[PDB]
Design a protein around this ligand. Sequence first.
Ligand SMILES: NC(=O)c1ccc[n+]([C@@H]2O[C@H](COP(=O)([O-])OP(=O)(O)OC[C@H]3O[C@@H](n4cnc5c(N)ncnc54)[C@H](O)[C@@H]3O)[C@@H](O)[C@H]2O)c1
Ligand SMILES: NC(=O)c1ccc[n+]([C@@H]2O[C@H](COP(=O)([O-])OP(=O)(O)OC[C@H]3O[C@@H](n4cnc5c(N)ncnc54)[C@H](O)[C@@H]3O)[C@@H](O)[C@H]2O)c1
Ligand SMILES: CC(=O)N[C@H]1[C@@H](OP(=O)(O)OP(=O)(O)OC[C@H]2O[C@@H](n3ccc(=O)[nH]c3=O)[C@H](O)[C@@H]2O)O[C@H](CO)[C@@H](O)[C@@H]1O
Ligand SMILES: CC(=O)N[C@H]1[C@@H](OP(=O)(O)OP(=O)(O)OC[C@H]2O[C@@H](n3ccc(=O)[nH]c3=O)[C@H](O)[C@@H]2O)O[C@H](CO)[C@@H](O)[C@@H]1O
Ligand code: NA
Ligand code: NA
Ligand code: NA
Ligand code: NA
Lengths: 338, 338
Amino acid sequence: MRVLVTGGSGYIGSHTCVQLLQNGHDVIILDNLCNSKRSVLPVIERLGGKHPTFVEGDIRNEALMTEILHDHAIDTVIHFAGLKAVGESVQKPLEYYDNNVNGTLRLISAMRAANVKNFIFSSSATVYGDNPKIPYVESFPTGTPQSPYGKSKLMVEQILTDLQKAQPDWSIALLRYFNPVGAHPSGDMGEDPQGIPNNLMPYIAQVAVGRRDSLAIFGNDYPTEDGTGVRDYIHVMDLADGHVVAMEKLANKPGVHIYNLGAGVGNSVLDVVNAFSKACGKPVNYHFAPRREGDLPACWADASKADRELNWRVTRTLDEMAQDTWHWQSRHPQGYPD
Amino acid sequence: MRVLVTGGSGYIGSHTCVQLLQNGHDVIILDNLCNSKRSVLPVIERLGGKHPTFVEGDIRNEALMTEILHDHAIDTVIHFAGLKAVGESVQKPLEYYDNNVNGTLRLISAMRAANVKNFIFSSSATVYGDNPKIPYVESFPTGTPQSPYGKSKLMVEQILTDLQKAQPDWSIALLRYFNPVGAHPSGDMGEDPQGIPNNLMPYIAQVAVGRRDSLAIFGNDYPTEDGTGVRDYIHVMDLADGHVVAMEKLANKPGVHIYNLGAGVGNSVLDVVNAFSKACGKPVNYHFAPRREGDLPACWADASKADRELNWRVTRTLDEMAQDTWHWQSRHPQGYPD
Ligand SMILES: NC(=O)c1ccc[n+]([C@@H]2O[C@H](COP(=O)([O-])OP(=O)(O)OC[C@H]3O[C@@H](n4cnc5c(N)ncnc54)[C@H](O)[C@@H]3O)[C@@H](O)[C@H]2O)c1
Ligand SMILES: NC(=O)c1ccc[n+]([C@@H]2O[C@H](COP(=O)([O-])OP(=O)(O)OC[C@H]3O[C@@H](n4cnc5c(N)ncnc54)[C@H](O)[C@@H]3O)[C@@H](O)[C@H]2O)c1
Ligand SMILES: CC(=O)N[C@H]1[C@@H](OP(=O)(O)OP(=O)(O)OC[C@H]2O[C@@H](n3ccc(=O)[nH]c3=O)[C@H](O)[C@@H]2O)O[C@H](CO)[C@@H](O)[C@@H]1O
Ligand SMILES: CC(=O)N[C@H]1[C@@H](OP(=O)(O)OP(=O)(O)OC[C@H]2O[C@@H](n3ccc(=O)[nH]c3=O)[C@H](O)[C@@H]2O)O[C@H](CO)[C@@H](O)[C@@H]1O
Ligand code: NA
Ligand code: NA
Ligand code: NA
Ligand code: NA
């Protein structure tokens, strides 16, 4: 298929692109480079074994989106482009609503204009909001996310859902997940966050590598086996794969297809730290801090539906998540070149 | 104050503008004319006793919005611009999300750029979603609206709320209400809907005037006194007034001010039909039909908060709503001139 991948140079997008190319699809990457560097492009092509077309631009530019779709005769679109920092979203709500909500809107308006009707949305498990019932199932109603970021994700899901109802020939997947971690097994692609990492893994990684002094652990008095918070982590390669399978199997199958992508289990903070100490060969430094306000003691997604309907399930482990991360750091200590 | 009124040439906006001008504010009307005609302008000026500046344009054009705010040194903005047809929204979701959600976003992004921080949002009681607890109070959590229109309204409320939190010096009112009806007592301004009226009143009005054969009443077996659905109707002059008071008293008072605007009581379908037969001098034709799917038997807003905090309450009656409507039809049978 001919696939446009917005946000194709980012973390999840880059790995997905490689898999797409490996499966022989024709890939067009659209990225504005606000959170990625052109230097990943050549890596993508090399690992994918095929050349992807790159277009630097913004999803908010409806005109350019239309042009692209037309020019490349796109069949389907995998949408990763947007902003995703939860704390920053509380500080700069408008940027989040413009990139995420308006950004998706402009993008699907261009699709309509170009006659494209296959869409894969990189969603978020934040949509379940504060559900005390765990694990989360696709059959659970959505809740109210707490940050502008979470809210933007739910808004886009609703917008897409109404669009499908009005244009019943569309096929739209809403892929929900929690924490993507890990890196391509080559160690030549991985997460390259700029500034302070918000996500546990990257943070742990930076402490281990010596960029940070110690990890602060938010609470040690939860009703969990070891007293630390239990979360959901998915290897970026498993996640990329899930996006590819969904794109392939859902194309031209009208409807709104909702799927949780995850391992189907939770891991504690300590579990993740220990996996990492293990991968990097030295004890990661940490200390305890108080609970982070609004935190549940445990949370994870039920991924049965995806197993059943798409025949998809994870195949990477927590240790591999830690190892592959350390492997990329080790090989590209300064990230992607400028 | 210097006030920009988006959607100033529309139904609610036109009446509001007249009141603003009467109170001596300097008014700038911004309207794209998609659902109104330039011919109301001169009426507005005449009834207001002062000249309002008119600018034809779209809220989606951030550049023009910025220019305007600057040029006219705006102090506060009353935002009525958007699309509001519930059925059409189910058919054309994207237009609703673009005009309402993106339209408000572009508008508040321009305000930020121009340093304007007083906003009055014309919201909707649809935000309470399917609350079985009546009457609805501002203290009730919001629910999930059922149509794209309802949803767009809740989305904008949330966006504004997050914006205020991030920019704490802003003053933002969220004015919620149900069914605006009626007309300026001069009979020289009123609702001028094109095509089939969706709202009960306008419909009743068209049947009475002879444009339609009969009113269909959706169910006569509800658990209400007369078996027909009980709703909330507010005279457009009372509504306009509430918008003016809110603008005046809330200016420069930081926060998100939520207020329901209504009479504090419900009226049945038959009640409204009888009021109308009364105003037009002939029995309105009607027949019963089955219940409309998703309808509650009764619904209305509690307006105590506004009485208490703004010292505002309605002063027009149901009969007046009917009379003033008939009065405008009688004087301007073809609506506003082309
Ligand atoms: N728990 C969660 O919700 C979960 C966690 C991570 C990622 N995600 C989603 O996955 C997607 C990809 O995230 P990621 O982790 O790879 O982050 P990322 O920042 O590496 O990738 C996003 C890419 O989009 C680009 N981009 C941003 N705004 C753009 C715009 N307006 N036009 C064009 N390009 C634009 C950035 O340059 C970047 O390359 C996002 O939609 C994100 O919300 C969700
Ligand atoms: N129950 C409810 O929710 C309730 C019922 C009626 C009105 N409202 C709200 O009140 C407001 C005013 O409604 P109204 O009844 O006077 O309808 P209206 O159509 O008469 O007024 C809206 C005006 O905005 C203009 N407009 C539309 N999109 C625009 C855009 N993108 N740029 C500039 N101008 C634009 C139209 O030309 C029109 O003059 C809307 O926000 C509407 O949703 C809510
Ligand atoms: C960084 C981020 O986007 N967090 C979001 C993530 O939370 P989520 O809890 O899934 O993931 P995080 O990476 O934020 O935290 C993982 C776990 O590690 C803990 N932890 C994290 C970082 C750290 O320095 N120390 C520490 O102890 C957390 O308390 C938690 O128990 O998705 C949730 C929605 O479902 C949101 O509520 C969160 O705001
Ligand atoms: C036209 C419109 O926007 N309706 C919206 C309005 O409903 P809402 O019920 O407030 O107002 P309407 O004008 O649609 O209907 C008023 C009453 O009259 C009845 N009626 C209406 C029209 C008609 O031809 N015959 C008839 O019998 C309705 O069943 C109801 O009992 O706000 C609600 C949100 O709170 C939405 O759920 C509705 O979709
Ligand atoms: Na339809
Ligand atoms: Na670097
Ligand atoms: Na802040
Ligand atoms: Na006319």
